[PDB]
């Protein structure tokens, strides 16, 4: 099917505590494969997936160079942001960057991304057409005019449609045995009385990859959207993911409720009933 590559970086300023903390990570789909942490001892881009370990010394040399140069770029951007927003240099602020591309089943380019957030909210982002920018406020409009003048978008468009998807297609090949997998969820139900008249029904999905999944509760064939507790999809730590969805049900009426599970790894969607 389709695949994605994302790089994220996070810069956090810490006045009177040194340079901003800088953490960068790289993913293919839901699989992390590199990281850099300014507080780590190596001061190197490091491997975090087996299939990237095969890259030569030059790869790590160049990746380290770019990511370290980026930490300094976003370091200055944090300072620039202070000016734009007229904020004191006593406060701690955050700058997040995301970049990457999507490809379809055929390996063809599908989508490119390049966007920033300041203190947890949109700052600037490359529009889907890869030719124009979305600025979130008056400060980002300043940056937008700068990037328009410098033709940043045409540079990044070429890179996203070329180098990025080229790199992604390569990683997908190198990590073929693991990255192309689709582990179906193993499903089960738990049931716990909470009083003399109500019971909890919890629908579980475990051991699945990729993380994308849909759990839905129905009562007599109707979505129970408003009464269901859904937890965020979570990593098992072994490369797979977990999720559950629960509903509180009148005792003796369990059989009216059905849990529906949808996932890329299933031949057909599953239905669970207590």
């Amino acid at each position: 099917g389709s695949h994605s590559m994302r790089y994220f970086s996070t810069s956090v300023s810490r006045p009177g505590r040194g340079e901003p903390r800088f953490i960068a990570v790289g993913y293919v789909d839901d699989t992390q494969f590199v990281r850099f942490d300014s507080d780590a001892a190596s001061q190197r881009m490091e491997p975090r997936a087996p299939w990237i370990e095969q890259e030569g010394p030059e790869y790590w040399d160049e990746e380290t160079g770019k990511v370290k140069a980026h930490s300094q770029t976003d370091r200055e951007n944090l300072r620039i942001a202070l000016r734009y927003y007229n904020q004191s240099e006593a406060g701690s602020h955050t700058l997040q960057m995301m970049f990457g591309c999507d490809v379809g089943s055929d390996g063809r380019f599908l989508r490119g991304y390049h966007q920033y957030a300041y203190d947890g909210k949109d700052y600037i982002a490359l529009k889907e057409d890869l030719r124009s920018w979305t600025a979130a406020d008056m400060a980002a409009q300043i940056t937008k005019r700068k990037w328009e003048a410098a033709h940043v978008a045409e540079q990044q468009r070429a890179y996203l449609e070329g180098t990025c998807v080229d790199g992604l297609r390569r990683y997908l090949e190198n990590g073929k045995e693991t990255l192309q997998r689709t582990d179906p969820p193993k499903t089960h139900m738990t049931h716990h009385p909470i009083s003399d008249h109500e019971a909890t029904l919890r629908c579980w999905a475990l051991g699945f990859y990729p993380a994308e999944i849909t759990l839905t509760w129905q009562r007599d064939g109707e979505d129970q959207t408003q009464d269901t507790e859904l937890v965020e999809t979570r990593p098992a730590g072994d490369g797979t993911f977990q999720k559950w969805a629960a509903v509180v049900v009148p005792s003796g009426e369990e059989q009216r409720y059905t849990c529906h599970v949808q996932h890329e790894g299933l031949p057909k969607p599953l239905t669970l009933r207590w």
Binding site: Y7, M45, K66, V67, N77, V152, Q156, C164
Partner: peptide, 10 residues
């Protein structure tokens, strides 16, 4: 591969 970000100055 990590992007080329020299030009990403605010």
């Amino acid at each position: 591969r990590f992007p080329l970000t020299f030009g990403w100055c605010f």
